[PDB]
Design a protein around this nucleic acid. Sequence first.
RNA 1: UAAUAGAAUAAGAUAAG
RNA 2: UUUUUUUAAAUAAUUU
Lengths: 314, 452, 297, 516
Amino acid sequence: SYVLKFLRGQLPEDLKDVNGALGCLYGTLPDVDEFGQFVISPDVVNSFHQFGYVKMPIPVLDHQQIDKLADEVNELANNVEHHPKTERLYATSLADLTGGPLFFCQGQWRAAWGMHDLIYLPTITVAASQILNNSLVRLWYDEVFMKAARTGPCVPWQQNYARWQHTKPVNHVTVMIALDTMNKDRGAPCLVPGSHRWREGGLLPPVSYDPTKDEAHQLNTIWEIINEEEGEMLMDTPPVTVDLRRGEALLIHPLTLFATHGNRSLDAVRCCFIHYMGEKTYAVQNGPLLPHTTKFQADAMIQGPFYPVVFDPA
Amino acid sequence: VSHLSARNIATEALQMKKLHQERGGNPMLAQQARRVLFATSIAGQNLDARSVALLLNTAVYFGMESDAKLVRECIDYCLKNDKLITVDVLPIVVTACATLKSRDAREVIEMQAQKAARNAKFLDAKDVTNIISAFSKTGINHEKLFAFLSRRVQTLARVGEFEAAHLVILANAFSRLRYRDKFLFGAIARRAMSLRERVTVNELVPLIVAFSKIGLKDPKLSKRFATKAMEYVDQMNAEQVASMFMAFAYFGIRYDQLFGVLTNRAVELIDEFNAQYISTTLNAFQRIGINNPELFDNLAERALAVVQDHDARDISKTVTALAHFGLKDEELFKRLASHAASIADQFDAMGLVNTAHAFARTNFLQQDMAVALSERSVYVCRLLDAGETRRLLWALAKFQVRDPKILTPVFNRCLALHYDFFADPTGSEEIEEIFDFYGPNFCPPLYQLYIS
Amino acid sequence: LHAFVRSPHYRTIPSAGPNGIVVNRDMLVHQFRDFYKTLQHCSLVDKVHLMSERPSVEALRVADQMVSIGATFLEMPLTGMEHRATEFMESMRYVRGAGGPSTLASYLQDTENCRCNSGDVVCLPNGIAVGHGPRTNAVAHTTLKQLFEVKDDQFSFDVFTLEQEGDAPPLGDYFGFAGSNVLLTWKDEHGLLAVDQYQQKQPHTEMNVVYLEPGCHFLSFYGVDHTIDVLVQKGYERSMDSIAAAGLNPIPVQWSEMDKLGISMRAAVLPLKFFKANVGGMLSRNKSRGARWQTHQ
Amino acid sequence: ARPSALHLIFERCKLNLVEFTAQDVYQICTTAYNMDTLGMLQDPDFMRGLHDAFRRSDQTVISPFQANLIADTFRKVGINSMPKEVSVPEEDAISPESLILVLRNMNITKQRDERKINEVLKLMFPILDEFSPTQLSLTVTELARLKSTNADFVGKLAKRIMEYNDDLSALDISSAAVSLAYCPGISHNILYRMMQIVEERMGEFQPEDYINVLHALNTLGPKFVNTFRKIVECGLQHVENMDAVTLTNYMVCFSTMDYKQREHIDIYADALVEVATDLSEKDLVMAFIALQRLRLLSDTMFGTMASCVIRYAAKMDPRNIAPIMDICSTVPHASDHLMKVLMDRAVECTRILTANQLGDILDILGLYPPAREHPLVQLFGKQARLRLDLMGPDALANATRGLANLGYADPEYYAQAAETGFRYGFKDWTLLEPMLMGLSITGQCPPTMVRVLGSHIAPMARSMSLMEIERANRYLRRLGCEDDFVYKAMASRVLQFVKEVTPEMPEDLQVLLQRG
RNA sequence: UAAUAGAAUAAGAUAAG
RNA sequence: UUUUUUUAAAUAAUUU
């Protein structure tokens, strides 16, 4: 077609169509023979496979990049001048146009710069490939959480794969990145060590969510979904909260029991979840996996513009 | 780059933008400029109005939306300090805010429109064209401002104060706004007359295109343009020949002695035509109505070689033109249907319905194309006319599509526009076909409205 | 130097001007276009501004609004030009648009019975020449002498009163300076009388006097910036020959219709010298006008 | 190393668990700026938490400059911070002090807002009678800095200030004079009365008063030359012991007013060059320009000032290279060493020079003999080819003329310059000529280019003199123009002066008379 | 406790009412 | 190539 002279430098309507990654945060991706620098130690992989989660030794982003990424989150929940490309999100907490004390966004990698760049970050993608038995890494989807000051709620105990039942094999990993300093008083993760090998790699029954109640009861709902032996290993190794810095990341298994604390600080707290999947991932039904996405059929290999390949060890 | 002040950043961003838009669209420069602009802030430093305007324009030019920090800072500066945006930097701000569609952008555009309306008597040759082009980028309906700018343009053109570039920019800007002024365009045409040899081939074709698009219905200047361009055909490029065909299809007057020469020149450069040029030539021949199989065979043979280069617009226009003329090219139609099925999500509201109707009119049914466009049809129902909805429904019925998730949007749209749906006589036959397939069971209210 | 001109209003151009002489509007428009191009081709002028058309043919006489005396922009009294008053307003905004003065001095307007007509003031070197004719009373002469006349060894400014008869045209139409020494005047009664008076009032001074044919309108930008461009009417060849032989550059301009309407080239242009305010002890760059590296080659 | 108590305090600050007021944030920032023993600026996660506390605090309690200092110390560490804008006082809050505070915050924190300025002026109009004499001068200064266009309100304030002449001191008088001089639209009657006030109390002036008055006189222009006269005589008894910057301002005023008394100018220049070594870069540049504009650059004068400017020539500002290059020319004095280092400095910063500065530098260096055998010609040719898109007609003419005079040969650049100049027509022959000089170096151009060039030339031939006619004919024959109209126009112009084909007439002119 | 300023510059096709 | 420009305008009608 003819792109007008003042529209030649524009970008696609949704950043899904942007093949590759823009150079905004860390420039361009390294060369094919330059991907060996971001490899992680085998002890980190062993710790992930033993505990069900692991904290990467080094922060993944510089402070200026974290500031820019937090500005993207701050502008993704404007509620006055709503974000451009808001329709390019799988879900939003502001669909009601009011929001609340908790802001959650999904599929923001198609809406803002930096967030689209964060998907192709080598530091986390190489580690995800190593976790996934050195295979192709494909984005599953994104998620952004923002809890307000003095009133932010807490997300109770949950299993990630319990929301991904339409994907056949368990071949997933979660990377959670703290865009702000976190603690037990503001959005720190609370994971159960060794909880990904409890029900023979199965899924625990969903927890009962009763809002408008204190955080202690919300975090104490664990004793209602476990059985006697799981009670014993919970007695032996109680849930542990991980303190995260301004850029530190955390790898989480899909089957690991996981919750987030509430926000009692004087400022909002932000975090970003990115879900990755391997090459050998299939669907179970006929239809789309996400709202307004490419539809697959039967046991169809999950691929397309909505699930880009972010790393290839070949 | 850290040692460079923001006044130098604006200059280098403008340099990068100028190199990008004109001297080839190198992605290297685009991504370097995007990376440089992504880490810039107008905070704590005193800056000129021109520097802020340049930063805003170069940021917005490189795909930066209204949620950016630099864009927000530049937009805020303009609002707080408005009088600092003189007529020299008004077009920059208007061009930057044209694509930005937000409350602050709307307010800024309105304030600059009023400023340009007040100061329309004091502009010179550069300012009038720059302002009118910048306001032609944005979609505005301030007729009074356009009339004042046209009066100033006529006053300046009486003393002969416009070059060929100024003339083409003015004509394009005024034809984009659909501002039909017989005297303004007569003055522009007479200024081209007076300029004479200073208007080259590269600067004459866009003038003819802009004069054809506005539609003045004046046969006195169309003949003159044909005569003036008849000597420049041998120098014309393929992209210029296609634009010439399109412009003189827009005019609507038949010039056989010119169309023959244009056809010969197009045949000479058949190896240089892309998909866009083929689609433009076919659409121009469809509009003007001449049926020339000899050029059509060459155009179809060329289009069979550049199938992978075809865009959704090109596919729609080429298929519609080939269907109108009753030309049978089974291989080309199969390849185009497969390609359209490949890029079904790029179709806009008009293109999807045009492609579906053109494929359904000819006895050509392909499940790869049919399923893809039927599924895509859901997202464009809300942007269609009553006649377009009727055409889309007939094409969907010819595909034998019965999925309720597809049929409910189109039936809702045709029910909301039922008066215009049933008031078009030329589609009456199509109506008695649509209800012949679906029957009274599907959407009873539409059937009852059809009976009445 | 910014030169302001106004486009003619084609609809309301008179069919016949003063003395009943018929005029042609198309040729008037063509000559005005040629005049605008000639002004633009002049190297001295920084910009040429074109104001919008106005219904009256009198609005073309733009120089009537004010005069430039040194660094003072003096506005003429609004006594005989009430119907042009609003027009003057529309001209000042233009001057404000180009970065010129915010407003003109109202020294002449405040004075009582002070009739002055811009064009009787001629900017001679180190002073001005005013005409004590019908257009200017003695009160205006006294006010101008009280304002701009200073007698000092080095800070000297002279105001010369040049008497003229009732039938004489404005002094600027037949008396002026060109280059740095040349005097341009008509070989008429009034021109010779004015030259003799100026010789009498400024003795012991050597200068060149060039006599043009009567009725040959001229226009020469005399000022701080030296120039040799002397615009002249096309018909008079001998005036052009004399100006060329005086060491200047004549620029023939077709000026038939405007002459037959009674308007001259001087009254059709508004030349104003604008500057930029220098904040603090800062000097502003100036364009070069001479040769560079003369010593080397 | 952070001990347990310090570590826990730092953690509480990092987690936004401590409610900080603006005063406490200011104290912490001052401590960090004064003593770096704890490494506060070396912890990004601590300074970011302090900034987050700063945003959510009440900043109205602290002075505007305290908020500006917090913002500056956050910017220095790498955090993008800006103090909050103050709201316009409402209802009972309108008092003179509260309204002056809004302008002061807009000044110090660089958050200028025309709408709030207008609202403050409308609120301050009715209560203008409650202002103390000092608050009126503060308002005048604040409005002068903000570049306000409401000259009527500033004139009212000036009248009220001048009503209190006895109360005001010399410093206040000088500040009011300079602030009024900076405002563009002030009526000249108020300026005349203020300058009359300044004329008296002349001996009470201090060096800062002299500097302020000289700045005001420089801004005002030649119309106040009489007042400047009372300056010069008043400065005649103190010239032998005066500050260097004051003498530079004196020279600038002498250049601006076009002073006629040469004895005082010579005295001031001779006193200036004694202490010219104490001047900064900008002051030295302005003094060097002022001495040139007054025709006072003798051999000793130029040598002494060039010896001083060579010191700053090593790291000269890009805005200062072109001026001293201009002063180096147009004088019959040896300046080889100065021009060498100036050309080297221009080479160093070739990638940051704007289009106008590059064109100017090339224009001055066009006719310089030692500039041809330099890398600068080639580097500037590439830079100009890059920057042709950002060049106006004046920059185009300057750059093309400078490159053509230097012998730089590049057909593509000259063709691109001609095409760029075809986009906006050449107003003058001086603008059009450099394109012809550049294109005549190669001696060939497309017929369309020479055809358009002739179309441009032919109208211009009705005013060019004989020398310009000969040069244009030379360029036209070099480019190979076959159009008859242009040659007819040039021959018609020639006939005006010659009127006949003189036998001695240069052989080149006879060919023109045949209208080839 | 905190206040100093410089630059003048034009790209150009939306399947319409 | 000779068409035309310069107010503070405030009086519709409805159950949406």
